[PDB]
């Protein structure tokens, strides 16, 4: 028994997971608990939705699998900072989706723990611009003449 003894470096599909992974035995022999493995996975990938995520299941001989990923594209925290209850629907004049500049920033800041990004303006345009993709507006974005 020592520090990290097995690292499962590979891709994994959010949700759409099952007792039939490429590892299975290569992971089961550990003795741990498969269902537990998948549970925490599926359970988190389910809490976030089905998708694809690169992971390196850091397994320590003490029989412990360290590994957690999340932070969906936008709706992740946008859902709150925005204000989407039921969701999208037929066109309407109600107009919804208003996030503030600082809020999208902080949300666009911790968004890159070690990603190839450090420019606020980039991550900003991402969360914001992405919002534009989705269908939201930012209360902060000067670019219109007053006359």
Curated annotation (Swiss-Prot):
A single GO BP term for this record reads:
translation
The GO cellular component terms are: cytosolic large ribosomal subunit
For this UniProt record, the keywords arranged alphabetically read as follows: Methylation, Ribonucleoprotein, Ribosomal protein, RNA-binding, rRNA-binding
Q: What CDD domains does the annotation carry? A: Ribosomal_L11
The record's annotation in InterPro entries points to: Ribosomal_uL11 (IPR000911), Ribosomal_uL11_bac-typ (IPR006519), Ribosomal_uL11_C (IPR020783), Ribosomal_uL11_C_sf (IPR036769), Ribosomal_uL11_CS (IPR020785), Ribosomal_uL11_N (IPR020784), Ribosomal_uL11_N_sf (IPR036796)
Does the keyword field hold Chaperone? Answer: no
GO molecular function terms noted in the UniProt entry = large ribosomal subunit rRNA binding; structural constituent of ribosome
Determine if RNA-binding is one of this entry's keywords: yes
Describe PTMs of this protein. Answer: One or more lysine residues are methylated.
Q: SUPFAM superfamilies given for it?
A: Ribosomal L11/L12e N-terminal domain (SSF54747), Ribosomal protein L11, C-terminal domain (SSF46906)
Q: Which family does it belong to?
A: Belongs to the universal ribosomal protein uL11 family.
* Assembly description: Part of the ribosomal stalk of the 50S ribosomal subunit. Interacts with L10 and the large rRNA to form the base of the stalk. L10 forms an elongated spine to which L12 dimers bind in a sequential fashion forming a multimeric L10(L12)X complex.
Family annotation (NCBIfam families)? L11_bact
Role noted for this protein: Forms part of the ribosomal stalk which helps the ribosome interact with GTP-bound translation factors.
Q: Name the HAMAP family for this protein.
A: Ribosomal_uL11
Q: What is the protein's name according to its record?
A: Large ribosomal subunit protein uL11
Can you name the source organism? Thermus thermophilus
The gene designation is rplK
């Amino acid at each position: 028994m020592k520090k990290v003894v097995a690292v499962v470096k590979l891709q994994l599909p959010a949700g759409k997971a099952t007792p039939a992974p490429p590892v299975g035995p290569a992971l089961g022999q550990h003795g741990a608990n498969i269902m537990e493995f998948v549970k925490a996975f599926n359970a988190a990938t389910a809490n976030m939705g089905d998708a694809i995520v690169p992971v390196e299941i850091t397994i320590y001989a003490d029989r412990s699998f360290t590994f957690v990923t999340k932070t969906p594209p936008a709706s992740y925290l946008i859902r709150k900072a925005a204000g989407l209850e039921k969701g999208a629907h037929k066109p309407g004049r109600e107009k919804v989706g208003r996030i503030t500049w600082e809020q999208v920033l902080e949300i666009a800041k911790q968004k890159m723990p070690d990603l190839n990004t450090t420019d606020l303006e980039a991550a900003a345009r991402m969360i914001a611009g992405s919002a534009r993709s989705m269908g939201v507006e930012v209360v902060g974005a000067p670019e219109v003449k007053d006359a």
